[PDB]
């Protein structure tokens, strides 16, 4: 087996189709299915999966009790085949902890968990199933990282990690892996000015990372990386198509180099494609709340700070809650460029829907296609009344 | 490994012995069994399994209430191990929808499911576990297609496809696909009416398929395929014997090139193996409603409007609830000639039996023999009282 | 992979080890565990597994209420890994039927099981999971086979069958398969006077069937059988240490050549090892009814009608149910000679436990050792109250 | 394949970070997870996994009541994958037995499990799934072995074994296997009083096992293997820091060849790694039972009287149930070095918890860093109310 290269394109992208989707709300409500949130999707050279972080109970369990929290010991990092719902009896536990990503670089995966209290946690590099490196936090302030897949070029397979206030400047570092060694690591440069829970993909250009800033502003910090340098640099998404949330409404004027003001202390987990004119962006509907989801193509959306949409899909909607959402693409697909694909994370339970005791999500994903598809809306599709 | 290549006649049929059973129903009354609707079975070069549509929760679940609806965002295709029954934590998901088929081509298998609202649905082709290519509505009306296997040449597979009224003229097409990419597909040509929902199965003359004409005919089309010229025709079963359900008494001359008139706007799929002397039909044994099951030889079915059974076999009784049929081979077996096969759905709930809120079904299905077996009577066993 | 030979003698057999046990009935429970009865073990040249008849339902679900029947269309022969409980998510349906045979050749494994009414049963063969040969019923009264596994010589695998009266004069043949095809068939010959359920083992000298006289007899009949030239003979174990049960009490000369008198019209499923002075024969300790079971060391027992015990061992107390034991070996093992094994089914429910409405199993299996070892018992462990 | 050569030394252990964690007894509140004690960890060269004594039933069966019993016919060595629970459909059985140990050789597995009673137990030896050889009770009086991983070399894999009392002198053993063969076995010598429950893990010193003297004494016995010629030695940890549990506080001056006196006739399954100035003792953290779990670094423990520690980790709160710890490391990893692991069984139910009437545990696994990393505390996390 060969290490990995991003040698491809993006295929056009001029809908979406649906990709998978596990109903894992639904099904657990009668089913062994265990609780989680921060989920998302990772392809090995063989076979796609779904991935999250498990709160170690069932959702019919009574140990669902108190889910809403964020960062215990029973939390792990779990793997489970593509549109089946996360089960006890069908789930791989990659690594023990609190935070993910996890990447295959086209001979093994590398799986990187972090675990601990809030000033003294520590991450544990997984590669091929053993741990390989580990690294204590910096900043003594919940280290952490992507909650979604990472990618590789020739064995190098960067992360993004942030250690530090949620609310404030933070310690960001990335982080070039290979086989689980680290090769180097580099404190955050450019003009992001905060960052969280990078979304990642890469093609022949290099790796592309659509991330949340936690602190001042609603339109997203974007860290573009050389993989091969070893080299990134960051500034936000232009567009005055604000894609955080919550969020202000969308102005005409965006922001380059500076968070675009009117929310605070708060955000969403995201992503987007930026590609010129095969540029997509990805956000909830609501302005307000994890509610709703769309995609819209907005041409030249990371350097035009006048673009706006000339195309969309809905993908869930706005009466029906969604949550985080990042990008995968299967880079072992045949064909001339790669897919761009995505998932919605739709949650369940509280804060939102405060009758049950628990927190919980399933799945929605999408891939991109060339045709002009009908679109559908892809609610989580279970009736919280069920769990009374 | 090689595309497989239709290369031999279909064995001698003198009766038909068992094959396989889940007995889901029985099952799923105290375990995690999915519901699910419209099954078939496919083979793979190294196993056969069972295939059906999920609807996303298991039948002792909540969600299961309701489950007589076709087409939600919750169902998905399905398959598992022979004669298991289809559970959440064996079941292995294709692809996301609420129409499908699926065939292996020797090298690999292509899946395909349609999902959207009835205005705007679309196919989505998967070949080896990727999505490779998808096709939009072309008449705005519920695209769909066979529920149950297609069929392979040298790679090549063709599969039947209807996009309109479900009870007037339609827009039939007959696509081409070779890994998963279409080669070619052309609208519905000759006698046939109106089609629905093809039974399909191969042998060195061809691919036949037979069909549902739902709008006005008791008697069922069929289309015969060639899959080298990737060209094909239509017309009915000539036979007297009708084999749609609901349908009028047999007559003594039926129809080749029109509807048999009686009973409009409903149908059920079903299958035949049109062989010359060889012929088998299969039909409900009841002519107003979805029960017992068995199969008749009709010498020269196809092409004779006065043909009628000289054998049969009863594969369920009159008194116990029957469902859609459809054929499949294994193409892999050894031996100089193609062992037909084929399952009856055997559905249990609404709106037959309204004391449950859901609807879903077990799977029987059988193989022929050259021997002269005796016969037994396949039902699918679950007492309905145990689920009040 | 090449065909195994029988080429060794047997091990000597000096004690009896634990070799597994899956405590089916306490682990069901409170699992999701299938009813069964008529257990065995066969070994694959890679693996080892547990074989039964499935009931088609799981013993906490409402449909194991009159799971004593034998003969229903919901049963199938089902395999398991050696020592878990046979469950609805682990269990793999070898074929449907309510009597069954099992065996690898070296290559792959055949599989034969019997479905359909009194009048009109019939076999399927199965040979590397695919259905090869059927047989149709030759007295119209039930045919059946072994209910144990079968046994191989250079790919040639002998079968005993009975189909006719239970409990009088009954048509018995010999099959014998190659790879699932008949390669010949023969009537009983010799002096054994009914034959059922026959337990089988080979060695360098050829295939030993122990079976059970249903009819007059409490001795049991063996059938010895060439491989190589297909052919049989029949006589019953001369010794007075009789073997089924019911049965009377042992006296001092045993039959060679006809039944021992005393019971009648009943039995059950046995097993011996007959090696001159490395015999051992298996029994119920009760002489009334399925309790207990004991291991007996009865020098040249097949042979010599005055012959008695000189070494034992206990298996399961005579306060403990038991019910059908049978022979299998791990013909692939390492070594200079074939280790001695059996299992005994250990039944729970009906008819003895009637304050429960099912009928079930588990398994505990033994093999032999070449030390003299200390001796436990083996009940099944369930306490029958908990499903109360 | 090639067998496994202990040619490394351990890497140096600056701190702990989590490996793995299975959540058991807050999953199995509603699931099906198997109640266990004695549980391990073991890697074979391309997988590690979770190894225990089952007692034969899920924790919300009605069988797990009296499960506090030590040794009955209900119990088996299973196996499941690294940090899932062990439940009735992904575990493994292993042996049937109520003490066991295993390991890898590099080529193929060896388990062995002891069943039997008090007077009358045997060990029988499994190599690659087949038993292969038996060993009788020497001294009558509860057979019994290691309860955690043996360590191979050039194929031979030795096993510590004891018979006789638990409170007073004993007749240890140790045993040499290779392929499941005895090779050769050899009485304990050295100043070591008492024996049970060997914790081992080899490097290219040789083995070194830390046991449980249950007699008098509060220090660790511990046992020098050399696997190439296949003699031992032993004596005491020579530290004051006592590692037992019950035990004394600890002294200034502790016991190299005798007993440290105060606590009699009870201990705990414990292990340490003795490296020189590497060296890292595990204990609970109460004196008086089983609860907390800490590491120490203690250099020359084995041979200085005088040694304390100089840096620790707590590993479990004191106010958290612990139990069982002992020894394992992944020898196929990668690297320089072996990297040393451990796990602690975390129990819950009787006998400290006794509004349950079952007894049960999770599991809890850590490996060494050479950094110095943040710490956590990792209790079993089930809340026993819920049980009720
Ligand atoms: C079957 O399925 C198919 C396939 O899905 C369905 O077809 C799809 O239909 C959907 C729904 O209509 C479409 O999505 C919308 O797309 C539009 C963009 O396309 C329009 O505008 C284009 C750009 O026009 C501008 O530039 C051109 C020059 O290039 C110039 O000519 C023009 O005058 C103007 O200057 C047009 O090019 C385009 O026309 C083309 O396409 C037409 C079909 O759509 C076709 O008919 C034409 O002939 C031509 O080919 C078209 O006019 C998006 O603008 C829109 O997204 C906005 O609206 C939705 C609500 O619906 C909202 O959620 C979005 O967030 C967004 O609106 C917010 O953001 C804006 C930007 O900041 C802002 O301006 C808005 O005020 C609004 O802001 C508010 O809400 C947000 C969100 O909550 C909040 O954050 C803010 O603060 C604020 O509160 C949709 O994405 C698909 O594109 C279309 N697909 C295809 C292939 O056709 C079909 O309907 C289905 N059939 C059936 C029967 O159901
Ligand atoms: C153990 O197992 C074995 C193996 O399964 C069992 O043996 C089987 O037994 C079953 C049940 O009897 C048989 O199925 C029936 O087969 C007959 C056809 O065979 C008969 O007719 C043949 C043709 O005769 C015609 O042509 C010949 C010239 O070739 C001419 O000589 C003759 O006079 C006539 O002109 C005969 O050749 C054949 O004889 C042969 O076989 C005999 C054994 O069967 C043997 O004894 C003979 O010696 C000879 O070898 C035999 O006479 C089917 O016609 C029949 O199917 C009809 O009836 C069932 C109800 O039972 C119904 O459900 C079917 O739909 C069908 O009847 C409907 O359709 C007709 C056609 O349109 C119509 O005319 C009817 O009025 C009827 O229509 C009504 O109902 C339908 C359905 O609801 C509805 O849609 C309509 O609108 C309307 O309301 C059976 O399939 C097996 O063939 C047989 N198998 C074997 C190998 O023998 C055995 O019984 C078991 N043993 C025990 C102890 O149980
Ligand atoms: C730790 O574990 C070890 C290993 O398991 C335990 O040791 C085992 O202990 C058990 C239980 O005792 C033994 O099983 C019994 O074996 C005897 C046979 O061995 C005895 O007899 C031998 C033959 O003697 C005859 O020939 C010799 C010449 O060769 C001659 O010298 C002699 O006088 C006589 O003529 C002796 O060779 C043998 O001695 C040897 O072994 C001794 C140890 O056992 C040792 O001490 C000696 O020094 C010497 O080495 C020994 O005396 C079986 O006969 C017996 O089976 C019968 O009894 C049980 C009930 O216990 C019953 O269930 C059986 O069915 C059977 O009895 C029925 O059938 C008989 C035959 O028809 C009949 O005659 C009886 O009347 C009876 O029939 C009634 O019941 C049946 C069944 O319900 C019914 O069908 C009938 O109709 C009727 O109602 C046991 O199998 C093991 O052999 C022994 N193993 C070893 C390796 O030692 C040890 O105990 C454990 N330790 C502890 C502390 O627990
Ligand atoms: C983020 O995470 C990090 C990483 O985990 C955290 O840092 C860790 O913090 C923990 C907790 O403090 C430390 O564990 C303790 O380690 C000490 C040993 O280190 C101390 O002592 C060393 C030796 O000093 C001696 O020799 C030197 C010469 O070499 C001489 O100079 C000195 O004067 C003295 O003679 C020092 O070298 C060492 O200093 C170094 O490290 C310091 C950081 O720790 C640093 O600040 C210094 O600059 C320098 O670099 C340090 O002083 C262990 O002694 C201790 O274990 C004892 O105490 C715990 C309770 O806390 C107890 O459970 C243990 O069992 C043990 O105490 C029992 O046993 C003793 C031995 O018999 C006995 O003497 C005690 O009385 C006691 O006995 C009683 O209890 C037991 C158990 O119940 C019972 O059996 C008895 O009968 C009796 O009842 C801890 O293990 C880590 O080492 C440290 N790790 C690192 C890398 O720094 C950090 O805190 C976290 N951050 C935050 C914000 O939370
Ligand atoms: C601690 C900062 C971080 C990013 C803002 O908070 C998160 C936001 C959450 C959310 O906004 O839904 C859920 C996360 N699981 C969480 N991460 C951790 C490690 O707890
Ligand atoms: C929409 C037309 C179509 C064929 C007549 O209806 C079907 C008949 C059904 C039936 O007659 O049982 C069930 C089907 N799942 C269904 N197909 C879809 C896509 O909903
Ligand atoms: C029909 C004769 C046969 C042998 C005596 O009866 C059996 C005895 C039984 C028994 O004695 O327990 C159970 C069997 N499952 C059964 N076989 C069949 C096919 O029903
Ligand atoms: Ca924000
Ligand atoms: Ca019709
Ligand atoms: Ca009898
Ligand atoms: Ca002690």
């Given at each position: 087996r060969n290490f990995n290269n991003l040698?491809?394109?993006?295929?056009?992208?001029?809908?979406?189709?649906?990709?998978?989707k596990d109903n894992?709300?639904?099904?657990?409500?009668?089913?062994?299915?265990?609780?989680?949130?921060?989920?998302?999707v990772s392809c090995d050279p063989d076979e796609c999966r779904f991935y999250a972080l498990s709160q170690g109970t069932t959702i019919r369990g009574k140990h669902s009790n108190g889910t809403i929290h964020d960062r215990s010991q029973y939390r792990?990092?779990?793997?489970?085949?593509?549109?089946?719902?996360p089960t006890v009896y069908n789930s791989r536990v990659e690594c023990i902890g609190w935070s993910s990503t996890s990447c295959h670089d086209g001979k093994s995966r590398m799986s990187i968990c972090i675990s601990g209290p809030n000033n003294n946690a520590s991450a544990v590099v997984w590669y091929n199933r053993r741990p390989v490196a580990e690294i204590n936090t910096w900043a003594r302030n919940?280290?952490?990282?992507?909650?979604?897949?990472?990618?590789?070029?020739?064995?190098?397979?960067?992360?993004?990690?942030?250690?530090?206030?949620?609310?404030?400047?933070?310690?960001?570092?990335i982080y070039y892996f290979k086989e689980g060694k680290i090769l180097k690591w580099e404190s955050l440069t450019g003009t992001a000015k905060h960052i969280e829970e990078c979304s990642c993909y890469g093609e022949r250009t290099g790796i592309t990372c659509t991330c949340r800033d936690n602190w001042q502003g609603s339109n997203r910090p974007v860290i573009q990386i050389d993989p091969v340098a070893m080299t990134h640099t960051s500034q936000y998404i232009c567009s005055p198509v604000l894609t955080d949330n919550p969020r202000p409404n969308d102005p005409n004027i965006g922001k380059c180099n500076d968070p675009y003001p009117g929310n605070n202390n708060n955000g969403v987990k995201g992503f987007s494609y930026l590609?010129?004119?095969?540029?997509?962006?990805?956000?909830?509907?609501?302005?307000?709340?994890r509610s709703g989801y769309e995609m819209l193509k907005v041409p030249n959306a990371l350097t035009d700070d006048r673009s706006k949409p000339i195309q969309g899909q809905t993908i869930?909607?706005?009466?029906?809650?969604?949550?985080?959402?990042?990008?995968?693409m299967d880079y072992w697909a045949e064909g001339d460029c790669y897919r761009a694909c995505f998932y919605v994370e739709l949650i369940r339970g509280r804060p939102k829907e405060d009758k049950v005791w628990w927190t919980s999500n399933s799945i929605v994903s999408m891939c991109s296609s060339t045709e002009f598809l009908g679109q559908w809306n892809w609610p989580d599709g279970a009736k919280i009344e069920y769990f009374l």
């Open positions: 040698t491809k394109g993006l295929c056009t992208i001029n809908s979406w189709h649906i990709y998978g894992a709300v639904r099904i657990g409500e009668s089913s062994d299915v265990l609780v989680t949130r921060e989920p998302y792990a990092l779990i793997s489970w085949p593509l549109s089946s719902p919940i280290l952490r990282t992507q909650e979604s897949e990472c990618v590789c070029h020739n064995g190098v397979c960067p992360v993004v990690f942030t250690d530090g206030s949620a609310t404030g400047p933070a310690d960001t570092r590609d010129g004119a095969n540029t997509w962006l990805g956000r909830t509907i609501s302005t307000a709340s869930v909607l706005n009466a029906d809650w969604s949550g985080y959402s990042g990008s995968f």
